[PDB]
Amino acid sequence: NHPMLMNLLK
């Protein structure tokens, strides 16, 4: 649901 944020967080 939040692909980019998720990617940037991990």
Place this chain on the structure above:
Amino acid sequence: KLSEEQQHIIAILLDAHHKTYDPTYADFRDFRPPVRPLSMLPHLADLVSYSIQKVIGFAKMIPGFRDLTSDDQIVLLKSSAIEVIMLRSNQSFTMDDMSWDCGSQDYKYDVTDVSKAGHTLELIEPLIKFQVGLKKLNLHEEEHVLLMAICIVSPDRPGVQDAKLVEAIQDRLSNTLQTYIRCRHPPPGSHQLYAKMIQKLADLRSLNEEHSKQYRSLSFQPENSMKLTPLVLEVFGNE
């Protein structure tokens, strides 16, 4: 006095900030060029999007932030992004002409530039007053980074699952800040400093609110939403 863990916390946040805020603003050249309606939307949209990535980088380095769930990290970031951007921008803000000086003329922003992004004085007016008040505090960089970290780890953000853990993380930072002010910040500059810093967090909530309202209004219009970025759309909201 400052325990060893607190000195550690300050050290970590200082480094994290130094790794996510480039005072030479060299990357601003990769953004779509500024145009001096809504002629500044492309440039500021890219600047904001960039800033979102930098805030995230800072957040991940906050002692304890990682121990939070994926969903909680996401909720905290989406709700604080605009606030941390406003807060971190105080570093480039100057009370000489009430503007943000990021190196060169092309990269120096004022009330006009922000309105040329679609925002009104309803937001800009209180935003400038905020910058001024925060600037007047003359925070030590230590206090500046602690304030941004505390802003990100707020227990009351809507949608927070493990609020208890969030508060625990934030308290650790709060106590670090309160102690630092007492141990390292000399009077009179330290007079009610903590209370004043916390008040700035309250001011940020209303700024956040007004920015959101105007953002939903602007982005509701397809032609404007088209000028944004995928990250801005995902983080700030997509109609």
